[PDB]
Nucleic acid binder design. Sequence first.
RNA 1: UUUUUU
RNA 2: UUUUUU
RNA 3: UUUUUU
Lengths: 403, 403
Amino acid sequence: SVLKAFERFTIEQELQDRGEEGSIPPETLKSAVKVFVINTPNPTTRYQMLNFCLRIICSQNARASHRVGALITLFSLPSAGMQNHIRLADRSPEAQIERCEIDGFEPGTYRLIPNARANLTANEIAAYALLADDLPPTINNGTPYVHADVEGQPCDEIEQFLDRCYSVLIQAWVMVCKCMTAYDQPAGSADRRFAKYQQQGRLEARYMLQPEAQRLIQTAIRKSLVVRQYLTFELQLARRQGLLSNRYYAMVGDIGKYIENSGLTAFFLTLKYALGTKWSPLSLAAFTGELTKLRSLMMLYRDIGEQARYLALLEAPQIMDFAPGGYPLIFSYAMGVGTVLDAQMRNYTYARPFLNGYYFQIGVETARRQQGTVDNRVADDLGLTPEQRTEVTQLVDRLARGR
Amino acid sequence: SVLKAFERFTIEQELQDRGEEGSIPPETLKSAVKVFVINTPNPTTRYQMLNFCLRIICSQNARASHRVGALITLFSLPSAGMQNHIRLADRSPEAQIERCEIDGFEPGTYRLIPNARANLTANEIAAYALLADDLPPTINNGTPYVHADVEGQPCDEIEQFLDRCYSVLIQAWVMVCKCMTAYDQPAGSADRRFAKYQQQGRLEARYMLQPEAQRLIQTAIRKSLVVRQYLTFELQLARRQGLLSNRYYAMVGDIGKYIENSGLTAFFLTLKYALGTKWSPLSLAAFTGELTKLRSLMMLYRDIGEQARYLALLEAPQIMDFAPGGYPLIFSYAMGVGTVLDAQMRNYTYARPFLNGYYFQIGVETARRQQGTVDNRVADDLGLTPEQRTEVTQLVDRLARGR
RNA sequence: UUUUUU
RNA sequence: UUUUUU
RNA sequence: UUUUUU
């Protein structure tokens, strides 16, 4: 009937060439961003570079673009040829890299030596050195390193530098998974994930970061889109990798696994919990108007281009389509099943005003009732007899006590 | 029988070459609209330009065309090369852009310097400067900025300008979604949507707009078709974009998602709620005379050219075809189901005089009765037994209390 | 005719 | 809109 | 996250 037309209509509303678009945007005011490169593998140079960039991260009065450049440098230090990695950042718009080359710091504290190919102004060095010591008062020692001793210690061996740099890089990395989300919340979530890598040994607690620097890195990550684009490509490259790999990319991918779906949490939780745990209510003939939306949304996520696993991290209009408000009722039902099945999900926030309490209570009661609705054509694969089905349901009822 | 002829007839009534017409209209009295361009990326110049345009927005005695030009300039400031964007506005009729070029304001408050290529009259500068301070008495501080301090503060760095300009642009943008609709209503709807972006951080509350300026922008958007055409292309371009994008177009698309279907609300709500939630009544053999109309309307919306998602925003005769009055009875039924299922829809207005109360009450009773009409050939995909169907219906009945 | 919602 | 979890 | 066993 006309229902076929309605279904094709609803899908067509969701296929307005939104998924794949490999085109540039109209040009926009860029930001002159000054970035520095270390061609030689000198470990002392890169160590001083890491310390300098971390200083600039906490530079209180620094220009935003200065923080962007310091961040991009930081994320690019581990690379052998930093020229190539610096090049990749420019592949995105909003990138106007004033790529500079410094063979190394002067024997002064943070005084710099520009190289012949890429030079700068004397006022540049003066302002950068001024920016080198602007540190938050809440931070106790001048260094963000909590141990407050290693920053003084040098390293002339590539191995020691690699360990220190990897540790600091993962320090910064772990904060990404909470970028643009629950920033005002103190570090109640990352420490578990951080401590895991710590006792994995692939992290070092002897070189760790103070919480204030952590939150400053959080702020810088949110404020600067350039670093966001860079983190995207870094992670996209990491995923495509095989088993054998270097230390750094291996760690990056390992953390990125659950870094990815930082958003869509409502969507993923809803889809999983509802459309999987289909006991009683999913067939109601009143959820169709949202099931069509859900199917279209799945098609969207498949045909975005596999980058959708980073939609929240890359603030884009697609989230507005991936919105629970589009499908309030199935959302209510899924929240109902989740608040019963998991224990941690109880700690999750579901304060969307459009939520229908009626369907929410429907979900809760279905979860606490249908526990043990065995009978399926799938169930008969095991071959159990109906007497066995009754036995199973009764056994569930025995432990149903303790509510 | 003849019924085939009737159906083809009714569709043919709806296919009079109404959908796609890439042709110009007969020429009409245009409006000399004076617009200004800033080729250099100077941030102070563009900041002063933004302040000036916002002044002219609230210019009480200004010529309508003056407000049109100020608006178009405002919407075009973020672009790198504003020449190109100014060119696009002229692609529509009713566009007679007196495109002017000003390298920057004079050291006076708002005194202007025209450039050699595009000059004007001295009386032009005099009148524009006079128009610069005409401000509504209801506005407290001279500036529309509620904080009333940043307008004095300068900015010589492109980043600061970009942040300020984006914030102001979204300030203006969010009011578009209510253009030509519920204008007399105070800002009871936009604040939720605005505050969302605010705590998204992509907006800044430190630079926000007073409600009077908001309503003046509303008025200007309604009165001037040129800005409407410009907003259309801006949004049409935004939609076709891919994942990676600049800040500004990303925000524009993100808001435009639900900016789009600003009209057809009756149609979309009706089609969704009725033709989806088909429990009892949809098959009645008395809704056919409107179901044919509905199918034809769906074909119209598909074959308009995907721009139909902006039919209300682009006041066009097609709305008169997309009229509930064409299909009063299915409208009654859908309003009936909606007033039961959603809670917010209760706040919606459905005061069309042609509404049949009988079918409305039919819809209401069907919604409150058929809740839980499980049995479908689709329902059997889950494989539940009729005993399970009775269990589900009874369980719904248990929570049916609380009406 | 247009009036919520996300 | 975004808010756990691994 | 990883923690026996053969």
